[PDB]
Amino acid sequence: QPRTFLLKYNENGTITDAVDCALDPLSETKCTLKSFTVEKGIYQTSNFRVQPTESIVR
Amino acid sequence: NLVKNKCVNFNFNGLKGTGVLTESNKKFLPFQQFGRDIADTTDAVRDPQTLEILDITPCSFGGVSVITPGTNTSNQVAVLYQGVNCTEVPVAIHADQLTPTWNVFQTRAGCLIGAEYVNNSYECDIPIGAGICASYQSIIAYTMSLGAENSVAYSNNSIAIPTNFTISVTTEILPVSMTKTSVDCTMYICGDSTECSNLLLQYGSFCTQLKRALTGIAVEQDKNTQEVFAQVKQIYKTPPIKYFGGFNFSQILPDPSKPSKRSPIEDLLFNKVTKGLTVLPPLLTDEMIAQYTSALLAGTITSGWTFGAGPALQIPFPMQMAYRFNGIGVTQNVLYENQKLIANQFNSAIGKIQDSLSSTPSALGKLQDVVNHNAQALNTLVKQLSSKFGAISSVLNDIFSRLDPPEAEVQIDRLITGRLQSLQTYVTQQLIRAAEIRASANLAATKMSECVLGQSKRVDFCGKGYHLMSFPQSAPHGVVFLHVTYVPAQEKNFTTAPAICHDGKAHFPREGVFVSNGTHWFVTQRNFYEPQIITTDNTFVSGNCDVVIGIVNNTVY
Amino acid sequence: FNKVTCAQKFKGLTVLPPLLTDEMIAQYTSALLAGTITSGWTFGAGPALQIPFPMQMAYRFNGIGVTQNVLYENQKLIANQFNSAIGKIQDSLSSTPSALGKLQDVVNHNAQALNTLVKQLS
Amino acid sequence: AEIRASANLAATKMSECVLGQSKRVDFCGKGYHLMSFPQSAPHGVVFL
Amino acid sequence: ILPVSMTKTSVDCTMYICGDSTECSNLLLQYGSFCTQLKRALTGIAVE
Amino acid sequence: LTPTWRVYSTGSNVFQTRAGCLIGAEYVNNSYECDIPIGAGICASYQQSIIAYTMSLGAENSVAYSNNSIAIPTNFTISVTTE
């Protein structure tokens, strides 16, 4: 399933945690902000929620 | 098959793209086929198999905004939809987790889902727009309040004359200068590669222009400091004795025990504020800037304000304040009769200045914003080196060794353009930010001249209220002012009249207003209740009686 | 408000509504207008202190160096002159001889920049 | 940036021409200033 | 008459450059952090 | 490097500054007004030779906060500036 993930590394090429974007508005904001920590405030997302459907050949 | 009202990828006549088919509109004609609006992208298409029309629409261009109480606290969200009304169904198909976070409130900006609207109003916390704000266990949307409701009982023949004052000190923070940055263009974009330099000089004086532009910014920062401070070439010294008529200045005068001679307030301010690139040091160091501040501070405690217009003329502080009180419109007798009270109020007020700065998280925020901005820009510029810029490798040497000479020239040119484009973007930001700092520097210089070197009659310029004094304090990349203001208090109502007619002649007050408690009429100034017996000295006879509206009978004698 | 007087959402262009609405801004000016009539130049430097308007006019007349008796002895004449002057303001602005052009140029430039951004996509 | 300069200028007129009497020449209109009245406008302010 | 505020405009960088092209996402990402730089710059204007 | 460049690379007239190392100027213990800015309160000028020093803010004049004491002018001077 095509998704977008924010992979985090600890200077050793190993993932400590990953943000699953498009899962919910909270995670999508972290995906747009490119940071696991979000400061207090209002932010605008990049519309990662929607995904393309099956292509229609015509 | 064909699918309507979905996010499918349309492929009519080999035209790729993702959109929504919708229905047939726009009045398609045999000549008008594959039509497009000002947005182009062929918003309307004709079916290949049939003759129907499909209007392509972008897949859920909602541009939603998410409100967060910060990850430090508990996680919560309230998505605000811009333009979309209460229905909120751009793409109903989506993961079930965020379906509840589409508790429905329709604002002017749009429908807000994820918080409960509260009919109560409070000071704005998280601005959501359209006169609505947010506040976190659960975030609540509340209409902002313009302030406490107040009403003035306006009435003719009625005046409210103050009977008390209050000495108040307020803190004003103004950035004065940025951090000078110098960059070697050859070293920045062509690292350890002489062959790269052989191609860089082929581009021309593009590198020279960027270096020259940053030079003007760097020399301007020293000018800004020379404008706010360095306004008095003479360096005065605080008198040995420090008995300034009961007034206390130990919190602002330089501390002999301090190695850097910074004042206790200045020390508090300093602590709070925290290749190819270079950070040039400022011409005026803190030890010299603070010396400039001490000279102005020592030149205002004694010698009055005269020192800002010529020679310094000694004037005892109790007398100096009296004159300043005359400026606000209060007879000097008030200062001398209440010297003990005013001195205590000034001492108490200045004592709380340090606590106000320490307690406030946003204290010295203006100075910190400058530091956090240019430092971020330098970090962002450095990260541009790792950017590929559509090249085989960010390493110049790598491209040379792994590619043929006629094939390399394409790639380095691609990389050289990318690095140059990123570098000139940073210079443009610095130039724009320099203008903003320059405006503050000019504003700070004006306040130094008008509020410190003299007394300003401008309303709400030095401080909130009637301006009395001003004391500057040095700060990292900025200045701090301590405005001393006059604020009336304890007002009482009195009955007034435009004029008093005696022996057939109208008597207008030379200064102050006419007051009377109900028995006898009096003359008091407009900023302090000081009753005075009406005589011919304080009232000038002008014009015949029976020509003014609202006169009252009385015996002026 | 009357005389001052889209499809870009497809390409990502958006307009953020102001935090303070027009009614909210208009309410702020009403407080300032009410504050400066009942009280004179005192509400901006502490608690508001009531004063009759002719008394306030006389003392503002004293600011320019004119004695108070001038205002009181010509209260009717001054009021009529002031009243007629206010009336001419409405019709002068209603003619719109590019008087409100300073505000409209801000809107025109903003629309011009957005328009040229979309046209550059072609 | 230009708007901010004008916005700051409007604040000074708000605090001096309306909140008090200004002795600055040609600041609050032409002639000896007496008082001023703010009026809201779309994306701007108007002084009388 | 003095202007006070201008129109607050925010533009999504990815949508403007790439017209729903998944492959273009990769390229723009490789270009660098100009997308975040422009959004942050416009955000400061809107707040101001 | 060339022999002429070595003279300005290492010599007797060496005076390290916060800005960096300075060669070709002699550090004078006296202080005068700034002529050519260098950095960190250091200014240089060509007196015969190039001399580096610390800029002086101004003359040290002390006034007396003597209470029951006042100084009033007995003359005046009209001057014209230029902006």
Ligand SMILES: *[C@@H]1O[C@H](CO)[C@@H](O)[C@H](O)[C@H]1NC(C)=O
């Ligand atoms: C005025 O206020 C001060 C402090 O607010 C208070 O100490 C004093 O008693 C009051 N009355 C007089 C006459 O000063």
Ligand SMILES: *[C@@H]1O[C@H](CO)[C@@H](O)[C@H](O)[C@H]1NC(C)=O
């Ligand atoms: C000023 O206040 C400080 C606070 O501790 C005190 O130590 C000092 O004696 C005071 N000086 C005068 C002159 O009031």
Ligand SMILES: *[C@@H]1O[C@H](CO)[C@@H](O)[C@H](O)[C@H]1NC(C)=O
């Ligand atoms: C009102 O003022 C008169 C004038 O001195 C005085 O005789 C009388 O006691 C006052 N009445 C009060 C303060 O209630």
Ligand SMILES: *[C@@H]1O[C@H](CO)[C@@H](O)[C@H](O)[C@H]1NC(C)=O
């Ligand atoms: C005072 O104001 C009231 C309110 O209408 C008015 O009726 C009365 O005539 C006024 N008195 C004077 C002397 O202006």
Ligand SMILES: *[C@@H]1O[C@H](CO)[C@@H](O)[C@H](O)[C@H]1NC(C)=O
């Ligand atoms: C007192 O007031 C009355 C009525 O306002 C007026 O006619 C008269 O001239 C005034 N003076 C004397 C001395 O009566």
Ligand SMILES: *[C@@H]1O[C@H](CO)[C@@H](O)[C@H](O)[C@H]1NC(C)=O
């Ligand atoms: C003047 O100041 C001194 C301290 O320098 C103090 O002892 C004296 O009481 C003050 N008053 C004079 C004598 O005017």
Ligand SMILES: *[C@@H]1O[C@H](CO)[C@@H](O)[C@H](O)[C@H]1NC(C)=O
């Ligand atoms: C001082 O006054 C005398 C008047 O004779 C004259 O020398 C001049 O006007 C004044 N001097 C200066 C330097 O202004």
